[PDB]
Each structure stands twice: as structure tokens, then as C-alpha cells.
Subunit: 171 residues, 4 copies
């Protein structure tokens, strides 16, 4: 038997433990087109049709973006774009309305409601019209059978849409 | 009715989605004492008694460390230290054995098994003895009623102990 | 050395593995009062004030119900009731409107929006009025600092309100 | 305007909220073979070779069992069986030892340690030998690239092996 004394400098009294953390992935799309018909006299949308190129996704992370294009997500080779088509605008007041339309994600189509909030209807620098509005609403991955492989535990069934638009008159 | 054209520069076609991520918290304790009796002739531990000052925890994050001291964790005001006392060393060979002892976390005591791995038994620079060994084992929070408030979902019931020791002879 | 043969009848080649499962807790309250002012001429609510006795919760499970009354939930000893007070009804059409009001959970008050859906405005068996409507909306535990101890991982930050009302005229 | 009174009998003041629950899946295999060489004189295993038919899995649930056979699990069409081959038995005492062997799950092989606990070495009813022992140990899905598609969040990386054997001498 012999007696020893730690050397605290080359000793580590260590432990490892596993925890879960919840976090929001924030994303946008760099490339999309839209057609916008709005009547400032009555604060009503008449047509809103948007096409978004899945390819142009950006979640501030290059390898996740690529991953989004694959089978277990967007399948961007087969379905390069997502579309929204307005079917009904129901005015609440001049700042607010309920927009109903058809969202199409990888060939699957559902009717969704977005909350329109009109934040500013002006004549511009030059005297041609501008508008600023937001569209907000929650959609369910399950409704669109999006990422069906991924559990609703790992990744939320709920996606929150925040469309912020500034826009100028045509011709 | 009027027609508009997005201004892509002040437009954001955005989304937010919630996901879970698993991660290991790695930690050590800066301040502990130990008594170590080991026989290099037979590669057997004779006594191993460790006291660890909960206060000296370090998980590379100052506010989590403080939080560990509180009611829902260590209760370091009431129970400032954790103790390990060896009860039995069962040799497997000269590199390996099973250590049994009593771990005490905030006044609750359980007998645990650690895997002893002896990685090097030498005479030092000066001709006095040194040893290097590790102790590894998994304990369950539930066995010690540690952090009973915190779900075994958020934070793992399993804690992995990695004690890495270098040590020098006495007097 | 000796050779053996399993006895399959008293042998178990076993394993245990831990998984997560997501589930909806559905609940109602057995005891509540309300005041309801509605104009069938215009399909508008004029007053809607509801008080709910926390004590009367029912999630089809007796010990969870009790648990809901405690500090980490409702604190029903201190705050026996939750209240909703309508502040604004904004008509969309005769079947649909947006209701705004003040919800109060254990002394904390936030303004919420419910989606009113009027499903049937009749004169009854006896020739006195009836109405049937629903109120639906999502509130966040965090907005009300409800169950702050419980992680948004274990238990969803989002609660979905489904109020289904059938109701008869007064006097 | 008109005043109404709830009809509590056809009114539901309801809510829905999502929570996580952790649970152990317990399982065994109905069909396996083994070869067992054990020396009661010295309480040492000499050979332990087990083959398990993946097809014979039973987790007390018929549709989960089928699911286990598929690509995201066992791939039982391609890899119908799992094998264990003892490489080393290291005696601790007559009741206890450390078993080392090669586990093979769907063509991927890793060396694992099981804790042998010998609970009873007798001569039987008839005067021929019997033994009862257990083998226990934890393996990691990740080490075997098992169910790589399934997150370590939904389903634990750790599987706990409990082999309980009763067995009788040969010829």
C-alpha cells in the first residue's frame, strides 16, 4: 500500500449530461414573384398571387438550406416552387382583414387564412402609389404532409408565416 | 383597384419554426479533496475518499453555475459538498477493476460502481511514485432525487462521471 | 468445461429503450358563469363576460386535476377563478367575427382574440330565442406567466381554446 | 340587442394542450439459438454464441413489431438475424464477471461488454447440471448506425440489454 496526493493541475473531476433545448428557426426566401391588386379607396385586396422558388431558401446556414431541398423536405428537383393564390379578402376595417387562399407545397394544396395588417397607404416621393402590409398566419406541416418522416416532436407541426411587403405602383 | 410590384429590397417572405436540439453539458469541479491509497505491487485501491465543493462547479457558463447552487439543483447553502467513499475494489486485471462506493449528493446516499482503468504506474522524475487512472460510470438523478422538479425529458436522468486523476506519492 | 442448452421457456432475450410521445390533453371546466348580449338583427355581440371556477377543471383524470390547482399551475387557493371580458366585436360576416377581450389567469391579464363562428340563430320550441356559437383561439402560457416552472418543451407554450356555446333568451 | 343565458348541458368551455411523455419500450425475441460452454468448477464462461431472428421481435404491439422489420430499423429482409459472439470472459468473483463480445446488428459489428451475474449453479431434479445467469449492458444505436433516420431525441440512443437465461446440460 502507498499514499498519494492528487495533482489538481492534471486532474479533472468531470461529468456529462444530456439536455434538450427548444429554438426557433427563422427563414426567408431570396427569390419569389408576386402579383398585387389593391384598392386604396376601399382598403381591399383584389388579387394576390405569389410564387416562391424553394431553391432560394435561407435559414442563415448553408448546409441546412441544401438539406431542405431533399426528399425529407421540399423535393425541389420535382417541386421547385411554392405558390399562394388569394381566393377571398374579407375586410375587417381599413387596417385589418382576413385573407383566404390556396397554398401549394410540393404539389399538395390547402386553403389557408392569413391576417392582413395594412400598415401604410401613401403617394410616393414621385407622386406614384405605395403600400406596406403584412400577412401572418400559422400552417400545419401535417395538413400539407410536409416532412412526414420528421416527428412532430423534433420539429414543430406549426409553421408561422410572416410576409412583410413594401410595394410600388406599376408601369 | 390598382396594381403594385413588390420592392424586393424592403420585402421579407418569412417563416419561423420550432425545433428541439439535444446537447451534452460537460462540467467539472474546480475544488475537491481526496485521499488515495493504492498498492502498485498488486494494482489494487485500498482507500478512495473524495469530497467535492458543489460551489466550485464549472459548466463553462457563469449564470448556469449559479443556478446549480439553488433549490431545484444542489442546495449548496444547506449541502455545500458531495462525497464519495470507496467500499470495495474488485480487481479485474492490472489495468482494470470495478470500484464500489457511496456517493452522497445533497444528503442522499447511494452505492455506485465506477470502472477503474489504471493508465500508468511509474516512479517519477525524482524517483518518488506516480499513478494515473480514470473512474467512469453512469448515475441516475432519480436514484438521488436530484433536481426532481426538472423532467427526465428536458434533462437526462443519466449523468456520466468521468474522473481523470494524475497523482504523486505523499510526504 | 460443460455444455448447456437454453430452456427457452424460462429464458428471456430482452431489451428496454426510451422514447418520447406527444399527446393532446383535452379539458373543460364543469363550473363557469357568463353574461351574453347578442343582436340577431345584425349578428353582433354586445357584451360577453365569462367567469370560470378553476376548481371545476376536468382533464378526465382525478390526480392531474388536483395538481392543476397547485403553485406550479393555477394557485386556486389564491386565484380561484379565471375571467374573460369582451372589449370589441369586429363583424366579418353573419357567420364569423373577431372577438377581442381581456383574459385573466391567476391575476395576470392579457388581451386576446377569439374567432367567433355563429352556427345558428333560431326561435326555439316555445318561440323564445336561441343561439349557438363557437369561440376559438390560441393563447401562450408565456404571455400569462402560467406554469413558468414547466418547460415549453415538456408542455406546449400554446393552449387552444375551444368554447362551444348553446344558449337561450332571458326572463 | 338581446340577453341570453348559457345552457350548461350543451355548452363546453374547452381547451387542448400538447405535452411530451417519456416511456420505456420493453421487448424480447421469441426465436433465437445459443451455444453455451460454462465451467462450474471455476465459474467461467468458455464460449457464448447467440443468434437471434429479428423476425421474432415482440414489443407487445403487432404493428410496431412489423415496423421494426423495415428500412428505418432492422431491414430483416436483407439482415434476418442478429448475432453475439463471446470473445473474453473476465471473472470478478463466482457470482459476477465482465463478458466481452461482438454484437452484429444488420451487418454492423461492434465489441460490447455485458455484466454477467451468475444466479445459481445446481445439479437438477434428475442429477444433470443446470445454471441460471443474467447478462446486462447498455449499447448505443449510434455505434451500430441503427435507425439513423430516427432522432436521438424521439428514441433514445441507449438500448439496455437484459438477457435472462436458465439452461440445462447437453446430450
Amino acid at each position: 500500500m502507498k499514499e498519494y496526493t492528487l495533482d489538481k493541475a492534471h486532474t479533472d473531476v468531470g461529468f456529462k449530461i444530456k439536455h434538450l433545448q427548444i429554438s426557433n428557426v427563422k427563414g426567408c426566401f431570396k427569390d419569389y414573384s408576386a402579383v398585387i391588386d389593391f384598392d386604396p379607396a376601399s382598403a381591399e385586396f383584389k388579387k394576390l398571387d405569389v410564387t416562391i422558388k424553394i431553391a432560394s431558401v435561407n435559414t442563415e446556414n448553408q448546409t441546412r438550406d441544401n438539406h431542405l431541398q431533399q426528399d425529407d423536405f421540399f423535393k425541389a428537383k420535382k417541386y421547385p416552387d411554392m405558390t399562394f393564390t388569394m381566393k377571398k379578402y374579407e375586410k375587417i376595417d381599413n387596417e385589418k382583414g382576413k385573407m383566404t387562399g390556396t397554398l401549394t407545397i410540393a404539389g399538395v394544396s390547402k386553403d389557408i387564412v392569413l391576417d392582413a395588417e395594412i400598415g401604410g397607404v401613401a403617394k410616393g416621393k414621385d407622386g406614384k402609389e405605395k403600400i406596406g402590409f403584412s400577412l401572418n398566419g400559422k400552417i400545419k406541416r401535417s395538413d400539407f404532409k410536409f416532412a412526414t418522416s420528421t416527428s412532430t416532436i423534433t420539429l414543430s407541426d406549426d409553421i408561422n408565416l410572416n410576409i412583410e411587403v413594401e410595394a410600388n405602383e406599376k408601369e
